[PDB]
């Protein structure tokens, strides 16, 4: 159980930090909101969507 | 200037978090090289490569380095 709890903790940490990154990018994009600002903001939304998706498999 | 400082500090927070993510992925990686084999390591190798590629994109777009 201790070692399984360690593996679980390492997966949960990755999941938690990925959700934090999603929020940091959201603040970045929200705060910055002309095409180039707009285009970076869409790119950030897309990067956020991606890492959210990829991280879903972590459960 | 308020807008510039706020953007710089937001990009800094992105840098910090992405550094922390990369460190956590390194640890998760040790455990996968040891916890067994089969479906889940190959599932993990898929997921890890995708995660690191998502991080590379974030760096390209946010430019945190």
Residues A4, A7, A49, A42, Cα dihedral to 10°: 160
Parent domain of A1: 1-59
Residue (of B21, B55, B54, B62) closest to A26 by Cα position: B62
Q: Any chain B CB within 8 A of the CB of A50?
A: yes
Q: Which residues contact A10 (CB under 8 A, 6 or more apart)?
A: B24, B27, B28, B31
Closest partner CB to B61 (pick from A10, A47, A54): A47
User: Within 10 Å of residue B3's Cβ, how many Cβ atoms?
Assistant: 9
Round to whole Å and give the CA distance between B42 and B37: 8
> Are the beta carbons of B21 and A19 closer than 8 angstroms?
no
User: Tell me, what CATH number does A24's domain have?
Assistant: 1.20.5.420
Structural domains in chain B (count): 1
Resolution of the determined structure in angstroms stands at 1.8
> How was this entry determined?
X-ray
Q: Any chain B CB within 8 A of the CB of A38?
A: no
> Are the beta carbons of B54 and B4 closer than 8 angstroms?
no
């Amino acid at each position: 159980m201790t070692q399984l709890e360690e593996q679980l903790h390492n997966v949960e940490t990755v999941r938690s930090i990925t959700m934090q990154l999603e929020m940091a990018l959201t603040k970045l994009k929200k705060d910055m909101m002309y095409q180039v600002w707009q285009r970076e903001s869409k790119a950030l939304e897309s990067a956020i969507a991606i890492i959210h998706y990829v991280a879903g498999d972590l459960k």
